[PDB]
Structure formats: C-alpha cells, structure tokens
Amino acid sequence: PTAQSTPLTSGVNSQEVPALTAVETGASGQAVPSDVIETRHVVNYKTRSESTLESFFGRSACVTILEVENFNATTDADRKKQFTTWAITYTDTVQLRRKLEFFTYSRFDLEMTFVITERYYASNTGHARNQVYQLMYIPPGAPRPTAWDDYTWQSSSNPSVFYTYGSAPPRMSIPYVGIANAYSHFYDGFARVPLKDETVDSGDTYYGLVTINDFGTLAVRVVNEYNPARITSKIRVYMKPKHVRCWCPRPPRAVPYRGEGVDFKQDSITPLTAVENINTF
Amino acid sequence: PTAQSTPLTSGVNSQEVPALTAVETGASGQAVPSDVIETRHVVNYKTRSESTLESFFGRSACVTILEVENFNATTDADRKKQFTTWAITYTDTVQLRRKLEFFTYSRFDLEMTFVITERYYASNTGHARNQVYQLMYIPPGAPRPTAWDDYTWQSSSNPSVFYTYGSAPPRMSIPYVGIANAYSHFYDGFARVPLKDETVDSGDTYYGLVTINDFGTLAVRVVNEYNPARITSKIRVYMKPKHVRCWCPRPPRAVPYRGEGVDFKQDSITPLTAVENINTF
Amino acid sequence: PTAQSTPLTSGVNSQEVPALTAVETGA
Amino acid sequence: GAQVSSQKVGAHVNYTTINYYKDSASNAASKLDFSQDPSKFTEPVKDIMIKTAPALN
Amino acid sequence: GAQVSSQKVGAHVNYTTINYYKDSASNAASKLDFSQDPSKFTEPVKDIMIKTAPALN
Amino acid sequence: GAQVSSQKVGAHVNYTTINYYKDSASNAASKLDFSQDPSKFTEPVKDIMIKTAPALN
Amino acid sequence: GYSDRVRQITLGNSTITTQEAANAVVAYGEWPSYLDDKEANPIDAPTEPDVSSNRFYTLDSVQWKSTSRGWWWKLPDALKDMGMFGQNMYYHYLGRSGYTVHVQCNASKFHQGALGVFAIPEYVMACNTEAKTSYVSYVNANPGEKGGVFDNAYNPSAEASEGRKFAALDYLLGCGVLAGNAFVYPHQIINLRTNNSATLVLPYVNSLAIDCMAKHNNWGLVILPLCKLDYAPNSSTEIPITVTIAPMFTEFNGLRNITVPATQ
Amino acid sequence: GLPTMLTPGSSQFLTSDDFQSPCALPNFDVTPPIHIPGEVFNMMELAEIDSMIPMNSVTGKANTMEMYPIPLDDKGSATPIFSISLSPASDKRLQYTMLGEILNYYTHWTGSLRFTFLFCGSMMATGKILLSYSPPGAKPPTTRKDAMLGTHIIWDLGLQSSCTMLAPWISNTVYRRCIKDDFTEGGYITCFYQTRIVVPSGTPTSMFMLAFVSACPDFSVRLLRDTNHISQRT
Amino acid sequence: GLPTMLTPGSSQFLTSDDFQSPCALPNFDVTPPIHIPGEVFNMMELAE
Amino acid sequence: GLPTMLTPGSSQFLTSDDFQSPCALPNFDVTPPIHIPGEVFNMMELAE
Numbered sequence A, B: 001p002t003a004q005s006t007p008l009t010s011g012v013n014s015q016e017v018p019a020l021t022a023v024e025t026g027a028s029g030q031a032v033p034s035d036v037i038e039t040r041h042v043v044n045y046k047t048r049s050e051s052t053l054e055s056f057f058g059r060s061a062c063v064t065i066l067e068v069e070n071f072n073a074t075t076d077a078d079r080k081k082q083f084t085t086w087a088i089t090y091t092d093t094v095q096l097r098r099k100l101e102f103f104t105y106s107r108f109d110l111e112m113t114f115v116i117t118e119r120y121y122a123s124n125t126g127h128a129r130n131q132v133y134q135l136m137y138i139p140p141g142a143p144r145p146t147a148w149d150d151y152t153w154q155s156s157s158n159p160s161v162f163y164t165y166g167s168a169p170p171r172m173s174i175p176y177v178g179i180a181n182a183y184s185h186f187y188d189g190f191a192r193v194p195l196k197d198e199t200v201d202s203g204d205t206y207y208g209l210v211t212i213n214d215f216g217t218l219a220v221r222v223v224n225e226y227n228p229a230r231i232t233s234k235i236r237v238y239m240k241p242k243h244v245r246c247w248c249p250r251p252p253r254a255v256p257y258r259g260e261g262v263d264f265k266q267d268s269i270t271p272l273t274a275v276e277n278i279n280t281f
Numbered sequence C: 001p002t003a004q005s006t007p008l009t010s011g012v013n014s015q016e017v018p019a020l021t022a023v024e025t026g027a
Numbered sequence D, E, F: 001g002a003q004v005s006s007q008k009v010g011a012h013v014n015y016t017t018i019n020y021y022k023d024s025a026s027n028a029a030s031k032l033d034f035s036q037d038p039s040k041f042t043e044p045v046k047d048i049m050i051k052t053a054p055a056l057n
Numbered sequence G: 001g002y003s004d005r006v007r008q009i010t011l012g013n014s015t016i017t018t019q020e021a022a023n024a025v026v027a028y029g030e031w032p033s034y035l036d037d038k039e040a041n042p043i044d045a046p047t048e049p050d051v052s053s054n055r056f057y058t059l060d061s062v063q064w065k066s067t068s069r070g071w072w073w074k075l076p077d078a079l080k081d082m083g084m085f086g087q088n089m090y091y092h093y094l095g096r097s098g099y100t101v102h103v104q105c106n107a108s109k110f111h112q113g114a115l116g117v118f119a120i121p122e123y124v125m126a127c128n129t130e131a132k133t134s135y136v137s138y139v140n141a142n143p144g145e146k147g148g149v150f151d152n153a154y155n156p157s158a159e160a161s162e163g164r165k166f167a168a169l170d171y172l173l174g175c176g177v178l179a180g181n182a183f184v185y186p187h188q189i190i191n192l193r194t195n196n197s198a199t200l201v202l203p204y205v206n207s208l209a210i211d212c213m214a215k216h217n218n219w220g221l222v223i224l225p226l227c228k229l230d231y232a233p234n235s236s237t238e239i240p241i242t243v244t245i246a247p248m249f250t251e252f253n254g255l256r257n258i259t260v261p262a263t264q
Numbered sequence H: 001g002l003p004t005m006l007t008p009g010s011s012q013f014l015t016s017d018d019f020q021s022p023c024a025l026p027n028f029d030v031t032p033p034i035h036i037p038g039e040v041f042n043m044m045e046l047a048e049i050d051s052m053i054p055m056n057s058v059t060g061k062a063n064t065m066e067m068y069p070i071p072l073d074d075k076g077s078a079t080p081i082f083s084i085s086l087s088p089a090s091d092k093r094l095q096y097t098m099l100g101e102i103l104n105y106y107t108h109w110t111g112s113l114r115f116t117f118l119f120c121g122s123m124m125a126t127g128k129i130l131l132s133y134s135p136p137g138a139k140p141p142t143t144r145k146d147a148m149l150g151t152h153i154i155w156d157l158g159l160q161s162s163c164t165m166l167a168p169w170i171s172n173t174v175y176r177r178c179i180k181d182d183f184t185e186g187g188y189i190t191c192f193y194q195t196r197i198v199v200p201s202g203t204p205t206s207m208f209m210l211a212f213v214s215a216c217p218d219f220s221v222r223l224l225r226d227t228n229h230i231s232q233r234t
Numbered sequence I, J: 001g002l003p004t005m006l007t008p009g010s011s012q013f014l015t016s017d018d019f020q021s022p023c024a025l026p027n028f029d030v031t032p033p034i035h036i037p038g039e040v041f042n043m044m045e046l047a048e
Ligand SMILES: CC(=O)N[C@H]1[C@H]([C@H](O)[C@H](O)CO)O[C@@](O)(C(=O)O)C[C@@H]1O
Pocket: A120, A121, A122, A123, A124, B072, B125, B126, B226, B227, B228
C-alpha cells in the first residue's frame, strides 16, 4: 500500500466547489491539489512504512541511569551504596515519554536491554576481579532488599538476570502486564473517593496516574564481595515497546516536564520564539 | 558469460577495410585482431567477474579516523575531548573517494564497520575498567551533544550502537538514503539562486556538492565515567557500498585532492614523469 | 482451557437452596 | 524432528522446538498442562452432594 | 514452522523467520501494518460531507 | 526460503543462502551481474557503422 | 428541505432543537453502546436506568465576554448531582456512560467570535504549586456543574497547601501542550457568523470496560474563545454559553449504600 | 557442537535492532483486549488533522492565545495580511503545529500541504481574499501582483466559512529535509485583500481569521530521528 | 563454521529462562512411576 | 541452546568479507528508482 498518487486533471468552471468548506463541523479541510489546480498524473510508489506505530516506537530508548558500588562499607550510607532499587517507570527521562504521550492509551510488550559500565574510584588500592551483577525484578508486594547480601536476592520466584561484566548487554522481553485492558498514559482521577466528614487527610493527597501506577521495582547489586579497590558502576536501562497498539491521540508535550505529572514550570512556558512581523519569510 | 573467444581466420585481399575508421564520429576504434591478422581459434573461458561494479566496490574501506578520550576533565577543551562529532562523508580519505568518482551518480546500500582501539595516556595513574562506546547517528535536525553525558545520548529515535571494547568490530547496514533518485558525486550548481539587488552576501558563498550535501553526524563517546588512568581511543570508520548501481563514467582523479571539492594544488599538478625521448622503450 | 465464565441468571424463589450446605461432611 | 506449537499470546503465533540431547531430563519445561480436579480436595465425599439439595438429608 | 516473507526493498527479496520462544512477547517486531482510517480524526461527522457539495446546506 | 546457487569455481559446486533480516539493505553482495553494453560509450553514434565499411561515405 | 443546520435530538423526556448547527460530531466515529458479554468484567447483573438518567441535563449558564479566557468541565463530574443519573452514579461502585454534549451560544449577525469546543479523554491538568507535583485536591478537581475557568497567567502558590488547584493556563490547555493542537481531539467550533451550537456524541472511552465514576473522569469538556467576542455598539457586552448534556447507554455495577464525597 | 564462526557485529547493542529475546515472565496470561475508540495505526493519520498555525506570534502575542488569530480589517491595505515560508518542520510558526511536531521526529518529508482558513468576522462582513503559494527561486512576493503569478485561490467570504489553499508538492528532490535548508526550500505563502473586507454600520471593522495546516493523502515521512523540542538537565 | 552473530542477552543467566542443558548423568534409568493418591496439577486447585 | 563450536576466523574483520548485518534504519522507504542515462555495469566497458 502506497501514499496517494495524483490524477491527471485540468480546470473547471462549475457549481462544484471543493475549495470551500466549514470547519465549524469538526471536519478538517479535505481538499487535495487536483481540486484546486490543474495536475499531471504522478504515480506514487512511496509508502508510509516508517510512520506505522511499530516503526515510530521500534527503538530501545534509555529510560534511567542507576548507580551501584562495590567496596568495604563501614557506615549505613556506604552499605546502601552496595545495591540500588528503582521504581520502574519511563518518567525519569523525556524522549520516550514524549513519544508515548502522543497517545492516551497503549498496549505493548517490552524489550528491556541494559548497558553496564564501571570505573576505578582510585588508583592506590590495587585491583578488582571481574564483577557479576544481579538485576532482580521485584513485583509489587515482594520483599525489597535492605542489604546487598540479604535473603531477598535468592530470588526463588522473582525474575533475576545475572550479568557478567564485559559480556553482551543483557536483554529480556516483558509481556503486556497491565491490570487494565490497556496502559493509561493519563488518568484524570484519584485512587480513592474521600468521603464526607472522614478523618483521613485530604491536604497532602496526590492526583492522577502517580496515585494508581505501580510496575514494581528493579533491584541491582554487584554479587562479588569487596576488593581493596572500590569500583563504581552505572546501569543504563533501555525500553523498546513492541507489538504496539495505541488509542486516542493527543497534542505532544510543548514545554519542559517538571516531574511525573503534566505540571509545568513558570520559567519554562514560552516555547515559541516571537517573529519580527506577521510577514516574515 | 565469458570474454570474447578468437575465431580461426586467415588473410584477405578485399575492398572490406576494417583497419580504417574515423574517430571524428565519436566512436572509438572497433577493430579486433582477426580483422588485421591471421588468427587461430582460441576458446576463451575467462570472465569479467572481478570488474563488475559489485566486485570493484566490494570492500570495506577506511573513510575516517575519530578520536575520543575518557578522563576527569576540568577545562572546556578537555570536556570536549570526552566525545566527538563527525559530519558523515567519504572525503576525509582518498582511496574509496577516487573509486566512486569514476562515476557521476550512484545508488547503493552501505555496510558500515568500525575498528576501535585504545592506549594508556600514562603509567603512574593506575588502571581503567573495560570501556563501552556509544556511536550515535544523528540525522540532520536532531539535537547534537554539547557534553558526553547530556540528554541527547538517551537516543530514543536516533540509531545508536553500544560497543564493548575487545568485542568483534561492530557493523550495521544503511539503506540507500538519498533524497534524489541517486547519489550525486558531482553537482555543478548552488543551493540557492542569488537574486538581483538582494542584500544577502555573495562574497563568501560556496559552490557544488558541499552546498547541498548533508548525511548527518556520527557522535561518539565512552559511556564509562573516568578512571584515574586517562584512556585515549581511536575509532576507524569503514564503508562498503553494496547492491551498487552507477551512471555516467568520468576520468579518474589524476592529481592530489586538497579538500571536499575538485580543486587542485599548485605544487601538485604534474602527475606525469617526463620521458627521455618519444622513442623510449 | 479458561477459568469459569459467568452465566446470565436472575432470581429464584425455590425449595432449591444452594446457599446452604454442611461442611462437617469434609466438603 | 521439529515440534511446532502455539505460543502463549502477548499484547497483540507458533514456535519451533528441536531436542538436542539424548536424555529427556535435558529438555526445556513441560508444555502447559491445564488438567485439574479440585473435587479430590474440595469435595472428597463418598456419596454425591447435589448443591441445590440439602447437604444432610 | 519457518515463515518466509517479503523484505523491505533496498537500493537495488524474501527473508526467513523462526520463533525460538514459547511466549509471543519474545517475538521480534510486528510485521508492517499499513492500516489507516484518518477520517475518524479528520472527519468524525454524523452526516456525510461530499467535498464538491457545500459543507453547510 | 533457502536460495541454492552456483559457486565461483576454484582450483579444482553450490552454496546456500538464507536472508535473516527484514530489510534488503542487510543482504550480502548482489549476485554477479555480467550485463554490459560498451557501445553506449564506445560507439554512441546515430547512424550504424559497419566495421568493414568506410566510416565516412 | 433537510439541512445540516437544522437538527432535533430527543433523549428520554427531553428534546433539543437548533436551526443553526454545523453537522454533529461522533467522537472517533463511534456511537455509544452497552457493554457486550465478551468484553464484560464485573459479573453482577448491571442496572441500566435508561430514560430516568439518559436525558438532557442543562448546567448553569456562563457568560462570554471579550475578556473571557475559557471554561472547562469534567465528565461524569459535571452531572454528579443531576437527577437520577447522579443517584445511580453514587449508589454504585462502577459506572459507564456515553454522552450527547450540546453547547449553545447565539448572538446576532452583527456579533463576532469563535469558540473551540473540545472533548478530551483523560483531561489531566497541571497543579498550581511548584513545591509539589500532581498536587490537586479532590474538591478542586471535581467542581461539578459550575466547572472552572482558564486564565492567561500562571501564578503558582507560595505555599504548597495554597496551590492544590489546577493551573488552567489557556494557551497550554492547562496541561503543557499548545492549545492550537487541541483539534486532534473531537471538536466543533461555534463561529457566531455561521452557527449557534455545537453537538458532540461521545462513546465511553477508557482503558477498562467500566470504572469508578466518583474517582475518575473519562472526559474533559473545554470551551476556548479562539477569536474574542466583539460587538461594535458595546465591547463590554456579554452573551451566555449554555451547556446541556445527556448520558447515554448508562450501565452501573456494584450496588451498595450511597457514596457521599467530601466537600472540603 | 555445530561449527560456527562469529562475524562483525557480534555482541553489539544496536538500538534499532529487531531480535527475539527470552521472556522474563514465561506463560503470563495477558489481560484480554477489548475495543477502545480512537485507535491509531500511523503517525500520518495524525498529520492529516488540521491544527492551528500560530501565525501572529509577534512580540507580545507569542505564547498567548492571541498568537493564533490573524488580524483583518475593512481598510483594504495593499500590504500582505501574512507571509510565511513553506518550511513545515523548521519555521518558527509551523514547527509547533501538530504536523510540525510529527515532522520533527523525521528527517525527510514529501507531499502536498493543505492550508484551511476560517473567517471569524460577523455575518454582515463581506470580502475577497487572495491566498498564494509561490514555488522557490524568485523574488519573495510582497505585492498582490507578484503573488497572483503563483499558485493561488481567490476566497469569497460567505455562508461557507472556510477556504482551503493547497501547496501542491512541487519540488526538485523527491523528499525535502525537516530542517532549514536552501537546497530543499519550499517557497512562499502569502495573502492579500483581493477587494477589501466591507461591513455596514454597527459592525466591528476589525476581526480575525484562523489558519490551519494539515498533510494531504500524498504525504509521507522518512528517517526517524530525535526531536529538538524536548530536553532535560543532566 | 556456519557464520553467526551474537545478539544482546548472550551469556546472561536469566532465572526464568527455559533452555535445554546437557545431562550430568547420561542414560540414567529413572525409577518407574507408580500411581500415588492426591496428585495436584494447579495451585488454584488448592485455592478452591 | 543448540550446541555450537567456534572455528578459526571467529570475530575477525576481513575487509573483503561478504556477510549480512542488521539495518540501522529498519523499514526505510528508499527513493524510487528512475531511468538515468549512461548506466555502467563493468569496469571493462570503460576500458574499451
Ligand atoms: C572518583 C575520583 O575522582 N577518584 C579519584 C581519586 C579519589 O579522589 C581519591 O583517591 C580518594 O581518596 O583520586 C585519584 O587521584 C586516584 O586515586 O588515583 C584519581 C581518581 O580519579
């Protein structure tokens, strides 16, 4: 299937007036060039292949950067650097988010890919053996780790991936896991109805998708015990929606995001650069 | 299909004179040995397989050498060493360019391959963990990085390849991406028509293909944060045209290039070495 | 094979009493 | 000896298996078995109990 | 269970796919779907509008 | 979708190709094309020139 | 005889006429309908109140002036205290509904102005404090039939507790997108020289078959002056805009005692 | 084992690759689909929807609702009413339309562009307006007598409220680039009073029209890319 | 050898993977099965 | 996985190799071809 070819047409002198319409109806303009000019025949062999939803979304996009370290931790703060937990979301970054938010609802499977990098913290503390990483998906309700070597990492039921530094970026597919019939990118509502004269707090409650979304937690550790040399690591998380369907198009985000909601920032709500004059080519 | 076999022929005494012609016509000489000598029959089983366009161009050729580094950068100049950008072209080198320029127009898909190498800058600063590289193709219009760790590298839509040092040279195919029906290797013209009495500058404008070509930008970084040991890297970029068609042959480049155009250099326009005499075997 | 679908039913006024049982039986 | 079977459906249909090893213990997971008979635990009674009837008559 | 399909054309024609996994979520990208119906957004009107006719009569 | 074709002969005969990718740009080299028509460059003349005849008559 | 400008709509015991319409929109080309057995979720026999609730309810009118920046409502919120629809909504945990929305604004052949009338699924709006995100009170999100107004200035609150309302900034559609692109949503325009009403028929839209109406608004209704009201003899004149909405194909599940939401 | 040999590309992560991968949640039972209104299949469906051009984004009006309405009056000036270049991805006014936003995820575009104008004066206002598209390479038109030599339509104001002017696909290249670029420049769109707007007494003598842009069915885009319209601090 | 190219995921250990692996005790003769009462097929049987 | 064994040559980049590789711009719609005069198929055409 191709885009529209142009038919051979000449001129008209007619009570048929395709150049006029009334957009009050809610219909967009419909006229094409053959309606308002003399056209030659042009066969159009070009296709809209690269603007299908699958093509538009068919990329692994970075959605967050996590940090973990491996060293002999002697304080509570340093013990917490030996592993990390991250609430799974696409709102830490802006690029994939904005593309998804052309739509109100979506349904897709996910390809997740990870890029893991290290550096030496210092050079006077010897070296470090090659590190193995554990990335554990903790669905809502499953126990979250409080230390890098607690019982949760045995991961009898949670899916974990063990990645060996220097090997190919690890990768797995996730099905469409939504508890509704599609994912909602926007939710105009609340998680509960506050009722007349109840004592529950109404002053610090939130609004929208953040009150109802929960895709679980990614927990990451280095499996190795500490070397004399402290190693610091970054884990970049990539998402590619595949087998995609979307519904109910929206205007795209026009101004910077300032969090997980639709809120905007007072110093950043002037996207247009003014033109010198209405007659500026 | 083979090259031409030679038929058995003897001599002639005839008003047929294939030895004479008139090249004023624009025809090259056409006569073959059987026209002007006595020949034996020789069956020719040899083929022109290796001079087809696909065979002539069927090699990955180095087209540029890029440099990137990874270290703790404290100045603007050193921050700019943490990533590099390169306008994609075949004119940084001469060998593939000269071969392509046997032709005026071409159409091909591209195989791109990369060879990535490192060395230690110094030896008194410890060591460095194995590095991951990101090579991002930035099509014209997409935002270009101003730092090695800015938002552009999330690459939601641009294609990126993440390469792990020591792994096989990375490789990808690119379709024929020209906005015309073939690539032009030569363009005898300008990007715009300068008009009578306009105030636009005409003293510093350029000419030819450089005014209209834009294949985007390759951006490269080391993804890892800095180690105590500074690592410097080279990325060699290789191109192989495949599925090749070409049109309108040209004399090949006879003197050194001096830039992206057809210009020549005053001290290098004497390719022939003079012979002692017109009668020198 | 799927989990059980729910049939369209209305009300009853009947000597059939599926709401009562006796779990002493071990059922 | 390739086995072609239905995949578990995703967001939006067959797959192929070949066994490479001579021991069945080497094989991948058993195919989905939807068998069940809850009544051996939920109703292991000698005499049939009709729901609509009295449990004790 | 090999699927043979047309490739997207290049500069100058089929390819083969076998699914290796039991979950469709594991599969590569969905095949090109050229479906479209712009009129549900560009012309979602109750009464048909003929271009050559007046929009309001 | 396997293609079986003749190899280029060596010192002393078929090979098999399967395309793994959905884009033809991903494919290996085009097969040998022995097409040629030197006369479009060596003899691009309007009126036929017979070798044995005078070029100018 | 028949005309794109003249229409009658009857639902239940209520009828609307217009003599200066401009066709009618059926959002996404889909008429509302009841929930099919093959797409159903809650298993209790639903209540389908039909004519008691599926009828035109007329909201309090608002005044269009040369300085108005626009108006918004949410649905089913705007109808929550409307006759038997409101009662059925609050006596049940779950509900679904389509709508016929009829926006009314007449003037004269000497007035000018144009209103964009948009039906927006999941019309999530920005909050009015930069100390928090997504920080809007239930009461401010759900004003009922009075709806709210847009402003052409954004002045977020000094303290988080004072900014728990929408920052309904007109040119960003109250949600960080440019208002000129709102036409991707089902819409009509009331351009005073052409028409005096807009009619939009809306199917139920959600990622679920049925949902909690008291928690979740499925549609926003936005009325924006695209071209300001002007009238030469009196530039400070006001003309009413009246919004009349009928639920359609309403269906409710999970009957219990009545929901009485917080009011402060 | 089966003898194999690794080729270049081995172990790389290309973000536009298209491979299978193991499922982390095997035999998961996805929520059954139901019909939801408004399904979209192609971004070009969205490009065919009219959205408003912020045509009057001058100082004091840019980034306000007043950036959209195009000023008109009954004075019959020979000055153009508006003038804009056919650069739908890169122009300061076109780039933020729905079409412009979609184009900024692509590198190449082709096809015809539809400009639809809605007159929002009173019913008592009459007028004729010339809308023109001049393909590039000549003096940009600043007078009606130059504009009318190009592709154009004369719009008579009346009961039918709206008029559509086409910029038909007229280009040297098969695609234009979604950036400001001399080689793939698109030409000039302008507008002049053909007669003038006329009103009787007791009627506003100044008023507005709205301009919309959308893609035609011959329109397509290529070469996915990141947009310059969204970013974040690092 | 057959030309091959490693993809992302190569060499990872995903704990929910489902691959074949070589048997450490080849040609082992498992104890024949007998019928045992109370076989369970699904955790939902227990939930009922 | 299918048992395999890497042979010599594995991971090398031979510049005259002839392998497939993944496309960086999947489902790209190339500009349709048109007839251009002067097509060349073999360098020996030029040698004549
Ligand atoms: C992350 C970082 O900046 N690390 C730097 C360290 C640490 O600052 C100190 O060793 C801590 O005591 O110092 C170095 O001189 C070193 O050890 O070789 C350079 C190294 O890059």
